[PDB]
Protein backbone atom coordinates (compact mmCIF):
# COMPACT_ATOMS: atom_id res chain seq x y z
CA UNK A 1 0.00 0.00 0.00
CA UNK A 2 1.51 3.29 -1.22
CA UNK A 3 1.04 6.36 1.02
CA UNK A 4 -1.29 4.76 3.53
CA UNK A 5 -0.84 4.20 7.25
CA UNK A 6 -1.21 1.41 9.80
CA UNK A 7 -4.80 0.20 9.89
CA UNK A 8 -6.63 0.36 13.20
CA UNK A 9 -6.03 -3.11 14.68
CA UNK A 10 -8.65 -5.64 13.52
CA UNK A 11 -10.71 -2.98 11.76
CA UNK A 12 -10.58 -5.13 8.58
CA UNK A 13 -11.44 -8.55 10.10
CA UNK A 14 -12.06 -10.12 6.66
CA UNK A 15 -8.41 -9.60 5.66
CA UNK A 16 -6.60 -12.84 4.84
CA UNK A 17 -2.84 -13.23 4.49
CA UNK A 18 -1.75 -15.84 1.92
CA UNK A 19 1.67 -17.16 2.87
CA UNK A 20 4.07 -19.88 1.78
CA UNK A 21 7.00 -20.81 4.02
CA UNK A 22 5.66 -18.01 6.24
CA UNK A 23 6.30 -15.41 3.52
CA UNK A 24 3.32 -13.43 2.22
CA UNK A 25 2.74 -13.50 -1.54
CA UNK A 26 -0.85 -12.20 -1.73
CA UNK A 27 -3.87 -11.36 0.36
CA UNK A 28 -7.45 -12.58 0.20
CA UNK A 29 -10.83 -11.70 1.67
CA UNK A 30 -13.01 -13.86 3.91
CA UNK A 31 -16.49 -13.88 2.34
CA UNK A 32 -18.02 -16.84 4.21
CA UNK A 33 -16.82 -18.91 7.17
CA UNK A 34 -15.14 -21.45 4.83
CA UNK A 35 -14.40 -19.29 1.79
CA UNK A 36 -11.71 -16.78 0.89
CA UNK A 37 -11.68 -14.74 -2.32
CA UNK A 38 -8.38 -13.83 -3.91
CA UNK A 39 -6.90 -12.97 -7.31
CA UNK A 40 -6.66 -15.92 -9.72
CA UNK A 41 -3.02 -14.99 -10.35
CA UNK A 42 -2.37 -15.91 -6.68
CA UNK A 43 -3.36 -19.55 -7.33
CA UNK A 44 -1.31 -22.25 -5.55
CA UNK A 45 -1.64 -25.98 -4.94
CA UNK A 46 -2.10 -25.28 -1.24
CA UNK A 47 -2.27 -22.33 1.12
CA UNK A 48 -1.53 -21.27 4.64
CA UNK A 49 -3.94 -18.49 5.45
CA UNK A 50 -3.54 -16.01 8.27
CA UNK A 51 -6.80 -14.68 9.71
CA UNK A 52 -7.34 -12.12 12.46
CA UNK A 53 -3.88 -10.66 11.90
CA UNK A 54 -2.51 -7.17 12.31
CA UNK A 55 1.22 -7.85 12.35
CA UNK A 56 2.86 -10.55 10.22
CA UNK A 57 5.95 -10.75 12.42
CA UNK A 58 4.41 -10.55 15.89
CA UNK A 59 3.44 -13.38 18.22
CA UNK A 60 -0.06 -14.76 17.72
CA UNK A 61 -2.42 -11.95 18.67
CA UNK A 62 -5.48 -13.06 20.65
CA UNK A 63 -8.03 -14.41 18.20
CA UNK A 64 -5.68 -14.95 15.26
CA UNK A 65 -5.63 -18.20 13.31
CA UNK A 66 -3.35 -19.85 10.77
CA UNK A 67 -5.57 -22.10 8.68
CA UNK A 68 -4.80 -24.52 5.88
CA UNK A 69 -6.58 -24.57 2.54
CA UNK A 70 -6.06 -27.41 0.10
CA UNK A 71 -8.70 -26.53 -2.50
CA UNK A 72 -9.22 -23.51 -4.71
CA UNK A 73 -10.81 -22.74 -8.06
CA UNK A 74 -10.10 -19.96 -10.54
CA UNK A 75 -12.84 -18.31 -12.53
CA UNK A 76 -13.14 -20.41 -15.73
CA UNK A 77 -12.41 -17.34 -17.90
CA UNK A 78 -9.36 -16.08 -15.99
CA UNK A 79 -6.81 -14.52 -18.37
CA UNK A 80 -9.20 -14.78 -21.33
CA UNK A 81 -8.68 -12.06 -22.41
CA UNK A 82 -5.33 -11.30 -20.76
CA UNK A 83 -5.57 -10.10 -17.13
CA UNK A 84 -9.38 -10.37 -17.11
CA UNK A 85 -11.66 -12.30 -14.74
CA UNK A 86 -8.98 -12.24 -12.05
CA UNK A 87 -10.62 -14.08 -9.17
CA UNK A 88 -10.57 -17.41 -7.44
CA UNK A 89 -12.29 -18.98 -4.46
CA UNK A 90 -10.21 -20.75 -1.83
CA UNK A 91 -12.03 -23.28 0.34
CA UNK A 92 -10.62 -23.48 3.86
CA UNK A 93 -9.96 -27.00 5.13
CA UNK A 94 -12.06 -26.07 8.17
CA UNK A 95 -14.82 -23.47 8.56
CA UNK A 96 -13.88 -20.63 10.88
CA UNK A 97 -16.07 -19.77 13.84
CA UNK A 98 -16.50 -16.06 13.23
CA UNK A 99 -15.33 -13.96 16.14
CA UNK A 100 -14.54 -10.43 17.17
CA UNK A 101 -11.51 -10.36 14.87
CA UNK A 102 -12.36 -12.80 12.10
CA UNK A 103 -15.48 -11.90 10.16
CA UNK A 104 -16.76 -12.30 6.63
CA UNK A 105 -17.76 -9.33 4.49
CA UNK A 106 -20.60 -9.24 1.95
CA UNK A 107 -20.03 -8.34 -1.70
CA UNK A 108 -21.51 -5.11 -3.06
CA UNK A 109 -24.92 -5.43 -4.74
CA UNK A 110 -24.17 -2.42 -6.93
CA UNK A 111 -21.40 -2.00 -9.45
CA UNK A 112 -18.70 0.66 -8.93
CA UNK A 113 -19.56 4.28 -9.71
CA UNK A 114 -17.11 7.12 -10.30
CA UNK A 115 -16.72 9.10 -7.10
CA UNK A 116 -17.33 6.13 -4.81
CA UNK A 117 -15.19 6.47 -1.69
CA UNK A 118 -13.17 3.34 -0.88
CA UNK A 119 -10.54 1.80 1.35
CA UNK A 120 -7.87 -0.68 0.28
CA UNK A 121 -5.71 -2.64 2.72
CA UNK A 122 -2.73 -4.97 2.58
CA UNK A 123 0.83 -5.86 3.46
CA UNK A 124 2.32 -4.99 0.06
CA UNK A 125 5.13 -2.55 -0.77
CA UNK A 126 5.20 0.84 0.95
CA UNK A 127 6.10 4.18 -0.63
CA UNK A 128 9.63 3.73 0.73
CA UNK A 129 10.14 0.39 -1.03
CA UNK A 130 9.98 -1.71 2.14
CA UNK A 131 7.47 -4.30 3.27
CA UNK A 132 5.41 -3.40 6.31
CA UNK A 133 4.98 -5.73 9.26
CA UNK A 134 1.62 -4.16 10.11
CA UNK A 135 -1.48 -4.13 7.87
CA UNK A 136 -1.73 -0.85 5.91
CA UNK A 137 -4.87 1.05 4.92
CA UNK A 138 -5.40 3.86 2.40
CA UNK A 139 -8.32 5.72 0.84
CA UNK A 140 -8.85 5.65 -2.93
CA UNK A 141 -11.80 6.75 -5.07
CA UNK A 142 -13.40 4.92 -7.99
CA UNK A 143 -12.97 6.48 -11.43
CA UNK A 144 -15.24 5.98 -14.42
CA UNK A 145 -15.13 3.02 -16.76
CA UNK A 146 -14.07 5.39 -19.55
CA UNK A 147 -11.06 6.54 -17.53
CA UNK A 148 -10.12 2.93 -16.81
CA UNK A 149 -10.50 1.89 -20.42
CA UNK A 150 -8.36 4.76 -21.69
CA UNK A 151 -5.61 4.29 -19.13
CA UNK A 152 -5.39 0.52 -19.47
CA UNK A 153 -5.61 0.49 -23.23
CA UNK A 154 -5.51 -2.09 -24.76
CA UNK A 155 -6.49 -4.54 -22.00
CA UNK A 156 -9.52 -3.04 -20.24
CA UNK A 157 -12.33 -5.54 -19.69
CA UNK A 158 -15.65 -5.12 -17.81
CA UNK A 159 -14.41 -7.65 -15.22
CA UNK A 160 -12.11 -4.79 -14.11
CA UNK A 161 -12.54 -1.36 -12.57
CA UNK A 162 -10.17 1.41 -11.55
CA UNK A 163 -9.66 3.30 -8.30
CA UNK A 164 -7.06 5.81 -7.21
CA UNK A 165 -4.89 7.79 -9.62
CA UNK A 166 -5.04 10.93 -7.50
CA UNK A 167 -2.35 13.57 -7.16
CA UNK A 168 -1.96 12.12 -3.63
CA UNK A 169 -0.22 9.02 -5.08
CA UNK A 170 -2.27 6.61 -2.99
CA UNK A 171 -2.37 3.12 -4.52
CA UNK A 172 -2.02 -0.61 -3.99
CA UNK A 173 1.29 -2.27 -4.91
CA UNK A 174 3.20 -5.56 -5.06
CA UNK A 175 2.00 -7.96 -2.39
CA UNK A 176 -1.44 -6.34 -2.17
CA UNK A 177 -3.02 -8.59 -4.85
CA UNK A 178 -6.16 -10.39 -3.78
CA UNK A 179 -6.83 -8.00 -0.92
CA UNK A 180 -10.02 -5.99 -0.38
CA UNK A 181 -11.27 -2.76 -1.83
CA UNK A 182 -14.21 -1.74 0.35
CA UNK A 183 -16.54 0.89 -1.12
CA UNK A 184 -19.45 2.30 0.87
CA UNK A 185 -18.95 -0.46 3.43
CA UNK A 186 -19.17 -3.42 1.06
CA UNK A 187 -16.58 -5.55 -0.69
CA UNK A 188 -16.34 -4.01 -4.16
CA UNK A 189 -13.07 -5.27 -5.58
CA UNK A 190 -9.89 -7.29 -5.19
CA UNK A 191 -6.48 -5.77 -5.87
CA UNK A 192 -5.53 -7.08 -9.31
CA UNK A 193 -2.92 -5.17 -11.32
CA UNK A 194 -1.63 -1.79 -12.37
CA UNK A 195 1.14 0.01 -14.20
CA UNK A 196 4.68 -0.09 -12.88
CA UNK A 197 5.58 1.84 -10.85
CA UNK A 198 2.65 1.89 -8.44
CA UNK A 199 1.53 5.26 -7.13
CA UNK A 200 1.92 7.36 -10.28
CA UNK A 201 0.01 10.64 -10.46
CA UNK A 202 -2.95 10.16 -12.81
CA UNK A 203 -2.75 6.36 -12.88
CA UNK A 204 -5.34 4.38 -10.87
CA UNK A 205 -4.94 0.77 -9.85
CA UNK A 206 -7.06 -2.00 -11.34
CA UNK A 207 -9.39 -4.15 -9.25
CA UNK A 208 -11.45 -7.24 -9.95
CA UNK A 209 -15.04 -6.12 -10.52
CA UNK A 210 -16.80 -8.39 -8.01
CA UNK A 211 -20.35 -7.21 -8.74
CA UNK A 212 -20.04 -9.09 -12.04
CA UNK A 213 -19.22 -12.36 -10.28
CA UNK A 214 -21.65 -12.69 -7.39
CA UNK A 215 -23.62 -15.41 -9.21
CA UNK A 216 -20.51 -17.45 -10.03
CA UNK A 217 -19.19 -17.05 -6.49
CA UNK A 218 -22.38 -18.22 -4.80
CA UNK A 219 -22.95 -21.03 -7.30
CA UNK A 220 -19.46 -22.28 -6.44
CA UNK A 221 -20.00 -21.90 -2.68
CA UNK A 222 -23.27 -23.83 -2.88
CA UNK A 223 -22.00 -26.62 -5.15
Amino acid sequence: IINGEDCSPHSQPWQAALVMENELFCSGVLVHPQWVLSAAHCFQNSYTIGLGLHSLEADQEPGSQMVEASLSVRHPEYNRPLLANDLMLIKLDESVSESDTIRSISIASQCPTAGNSCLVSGWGLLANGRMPTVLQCVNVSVVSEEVCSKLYDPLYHPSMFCAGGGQDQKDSCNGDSGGPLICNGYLQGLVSFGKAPCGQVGVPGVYTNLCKFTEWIEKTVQA
Binding site: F25, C26, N174
Partner: peptide, 14 residues
Protein backbone atom coordinates in the same frame (compact mmCIF):
# COMPACT_ATOMS: atom_id res chain seq x y z
CA UNK B 1 4.42 -2.17 -18.21
CA UNK B 2 1.43 -3.84 -16.56
CA UNK B 3 2.08 -5.89 -13.42
CA UNK B 4 -0.16 -8.22 -11.46
CA UNK B 5 0.43 -7.12 -7.88
CA UNK B 6 1.49 -10.34 -6.15
CA UNK B 7 4.90 -10.50 -4.50
CA UNK B 8 6.93 -11.18 -6.50
CA UNK B 9 4.73 -9.52 -9.14
CA UNK B 10 3.91 -10.88 -12.59
CA UNK B 11 4.93 -8.26 -15.13
CA UNK B 12 4.38 -7.96 -18.86
CA UNK B 13 6.16 -6.11 -21.74
CA UNK B 14 3.48 -3.38 -21.69
Amino acid sequence: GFCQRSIPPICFPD
